[PDB]
Amino acid sequence: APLIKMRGYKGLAGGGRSLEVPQPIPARQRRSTAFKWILDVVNKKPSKGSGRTMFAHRVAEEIVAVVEGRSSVWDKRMLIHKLGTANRANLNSPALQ
Amino acid sequence: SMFRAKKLDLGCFTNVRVLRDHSKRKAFLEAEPERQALRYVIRNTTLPARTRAVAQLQLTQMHAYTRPTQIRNRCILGGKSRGILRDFKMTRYNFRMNALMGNIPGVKKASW
């Protein structure tokens, strides 16, 4: 789960650009965003078998690849963390004051 | 034209078509038992073919007014034929205005 969220302020960065500012998100908003990513990866995989356990086993295999650190959501997490780290100075920006 | 009463008997809102739909309800009332014997002989597959063909030709010669499908309910206050309520013989509108004033018994504005 990412520890921050990005929300921009309409027209405060430059000539028609928004000032992106990172914000922290609570627990419920942290797990939700994480599990929604897992389903995204699952819905893009191809089908492997038949029966009722098709979707259930496609989600569980992603929950095992996340604990093993070999999942595609890890690249999706660190990608949002970089934006915050890069925009950590916008908190005290002069356009918000 | 031949079925239009020479003396007006309608007591409700009179109209060109209200006077024309009233002449059809009376012409069908007189020929309904006769028109139901031609539809029975046409559908009775036990009678000879010629018997059913003669009734089929005579039903086609009946005047249009005698046909029951020509009858269409009309508002007794406005004379329209579109959006008539069978329970009140009025349009959806005339029903509303009268219901609010209190002229239609029992009808009340519904909230729930």
């Binding site: 191809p46 492997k48 078998g49 038949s50 029966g51 356990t53 | -």
Partner: protein
Amino acid sequence: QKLRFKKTKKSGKPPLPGERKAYRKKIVLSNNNALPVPGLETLRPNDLAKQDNVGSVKALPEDVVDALRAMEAFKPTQCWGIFRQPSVLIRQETVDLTKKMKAAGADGKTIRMVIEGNRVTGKSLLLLQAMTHAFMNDWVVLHIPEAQELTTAVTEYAPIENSPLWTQPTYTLK
């Protein structure tokens, strides 16, 4: 000439034939993660007949699991991949049935009964316990796993000369 908008038009190895069907039918009769239950005893040739075992769980012999697995005794719906060693429960009906099957072969008699019940009441796995008591006592087990493969028109069939019967060669061979 039409001038509306029209969307313009624009990966992995496929599974082998029969791979998908074999996925929703494989039976997992073991789970390493599960703990080895201490005191779990194995069955014996005359262990499904004793009534003092009613209400106790016993593990199936490893040699019987090779036979029950050969004639498709286990099923996907049944959950065996949750424990380590396939084990059954000696029910009060098992001892009721086994004693009849044990006395039938004793005097060459034949018992003919129809196991009946409501939804998941143990009906099938009681046949798996009747086959287990057969293998362990030197019997000949001829089992038809699914009776719907013979009537749903899914296997080859051919008639017999001068007879109303019909044979099923492909199924009889397998």
